[PDB]
Design a protein around this ligand. Sequence first.
Ligand SMILES: CO[C@H]1CC[C@H](n2c(=O)c(-c3cc[nH]n3)cc3c(C)nc(N)nc32)CC1
Length: 839
Amino acid sequence: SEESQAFQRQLTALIGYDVTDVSNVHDDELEFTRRGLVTPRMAEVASRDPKLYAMHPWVTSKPLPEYLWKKIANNCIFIVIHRSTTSQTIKVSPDDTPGAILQSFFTKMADFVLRVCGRDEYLVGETPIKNFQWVRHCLKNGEEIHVVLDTPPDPALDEVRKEESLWDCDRKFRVKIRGIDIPVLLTVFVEANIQHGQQVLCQRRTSPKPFTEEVLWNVWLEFSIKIKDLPKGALLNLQIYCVQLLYYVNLLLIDHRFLLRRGEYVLHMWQISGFNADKLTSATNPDKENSMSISILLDNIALPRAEMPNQLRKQLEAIIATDPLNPLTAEDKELLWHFRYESLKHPKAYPKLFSSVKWGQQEIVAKTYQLLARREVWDQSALDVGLTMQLLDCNFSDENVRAIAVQKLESLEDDDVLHYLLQLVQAVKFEPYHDSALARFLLKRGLRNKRIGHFLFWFLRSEIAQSRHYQQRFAVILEAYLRGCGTAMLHDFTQQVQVIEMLQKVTLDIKSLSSSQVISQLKQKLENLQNSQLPESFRVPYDPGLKAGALAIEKCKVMASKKKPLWLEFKCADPTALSNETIGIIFKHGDDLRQDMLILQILRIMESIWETESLDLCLLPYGCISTGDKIGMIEIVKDATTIAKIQQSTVGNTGAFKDEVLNHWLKEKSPTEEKFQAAVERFVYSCAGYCVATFVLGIGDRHNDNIMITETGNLFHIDFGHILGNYRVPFVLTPDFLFVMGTSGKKTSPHFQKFQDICVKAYLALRHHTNLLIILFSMMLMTGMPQLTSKEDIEYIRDALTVGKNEEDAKKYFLDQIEVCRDKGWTVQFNWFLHLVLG
Ligand SMILES: CO[C@H]1CC[C@H](n2c(=O)c(-c3cc[nH]n3)cc3c(C)nc(N)nc32)CC1
């Protein structure tokens, strides 16, 4: 078709990569997968309720926590319905359905849908109003709940554009190397490995030859594994050391069709930088003008109850009970396997057990499967995500094991799927194949909920636009989602992309020039754009509810830092919006906004752990979307400053920090005094919040420049990309912080103990999720952190969370940590000032 060519040009510029382009491919896997997704995509589209999908209610089944119940007047919530101009303030019960809140109207001030004013959120379908996210957001931050009444949007706008044996030869496996060759340049050798999720099964080397632009061997490297002892998901890792490694590449030996790989391959290899998830990618380096290559040939076949002691039991229970990161001696691993039927009665163990498998052995594998048919306890166990993520990481490469974890994630409601989304997406870099339970899961879920679908889009787009190792695979998943999400959404994503592409040119261009002149160019270009370049409005990608209209040009300015971020403001586009509080977004280049993303996502997780215990530690995990490479957008938190700049009030050229200043500033910026006291509380709550979390994530030692506070009390950290991209005190708890809590020095106050009492309830609440927190951290480093991966980097968290220790020992350690701060006072900050501002 013609208006089908049309499409594949559109997608190709939403996606940001051309999924039809076949050069950088040595087989039809992406194609196969492109085709493969078509049935789970269509199936989900043919399944959604067109109404409930049109209005995308943001809803939760979690128990409405205490702190919010308490903030109630008496089983009585106030809702201010608007319409033309006038209002109406109905008294309603938290348990009242939104359909019913009209039987409190069609029979009160004497069909219609209820949209949150100024947002694209709707209160609909059978849920107790207590259960809507926006309601909860209103009860905490204590605003009123305003709603416009209007027409349901037309479900027909979510219209989708139509379209239609190896278990025998006991041959030892072998690899003919031919040789290697590289555009422009010693001693050198191919190293070949046969791997299954980090378990390295076999291994050979080549005889070191002089290092020249072409080096040939014609060797048969013969392996010790047998053609039938090969497992689906086995990679042939090829590497080139010269002794240091310089280049890598991988190839599956069992292709996506269950067929052993045959024939002739020439592969463009990946270079090194300056472990991580890119050394695992089945994708070859697109750059050919410059990439090192390796030539190979392939052989010239399809893949188809005892008792127990009383001390071994206690060796097992120890083993099972240990954290995810503690390694297992061969002695440990032989034990798990032997008593595997008993090992299966505990979900907690599946990781460790499935790691005890000798995957390079055909019969072991089968008994493994035999085990998996006896999966009962698991299928029945209450879903635990930390455990479930574990089976999705780089260690597990059996499709079927990975599959049991993904079946366990099917049981997550959308609220929860939004919490873990970013890590689940990253988790795709660990899938051996392109088409997996995990990718389809992500697919279904995005196609079933515009909110999830919105973020899925940016997450995938983010990886695509900067990962050369995963773009293809990700590009195929994106396209699958685009072809099923409705032209409504489709057209909506298009506006979004146009704008943010517009805005990056500006960012990078302003960056190129470096001052009074500049202010002008900025203003010049920003009105160059409010014509027929910029469309009239667009959704905010970090918050899909917010319609941004016109660029509030005056307020837009360029900032004062090494990187010259563009501070922008946006008139809300929605006229039902009961305020003029513009939308603030910062466009930055030069920092790994990704790293920020991962951290923030863990921040939002910590909050929803403290909530399981009616604890609210007042975090501000501001919206952050990475758009490209060292480039993206950040949400602006209103009415905030940097702690360094509050210090700069009373000195700049120096920062001879004074302890009085912050509490002066709060008093200075507090209207009544009922407020000032709340503000001081929110500080104490926020500050304790960041103190713990910052601590556990091991990005606690920062400098006041990177710490902000709102005019209303709330403290929060920013610019995570900085230290994680570059990398003593455990965390910033300065004297000026103390002074506010009412303790100049080594005294004590009813506010400080409040604080110190909060950190502990806090520090102990997370420890109930040791495993979870550990695995996420482990993953975040593999997927997002370059080089600072070692292994001892990972183990950092094992210390912080203090694996092994009982609750009491645990309270002591965090209190100690609070002490190194009381000790060091201003030292470290003053050290940073030296370093950062001058040294
Ligand atoms: C020069 O003046 C600066 C202007 C920009 C300010 N700034 C940031 O840099 C970052 C941020 C997040 C990651 N990198 N940067 C976040 C940030 C947030 C969330 N809110 C606000 N109200 N300002 C922020 C900081 C002061």
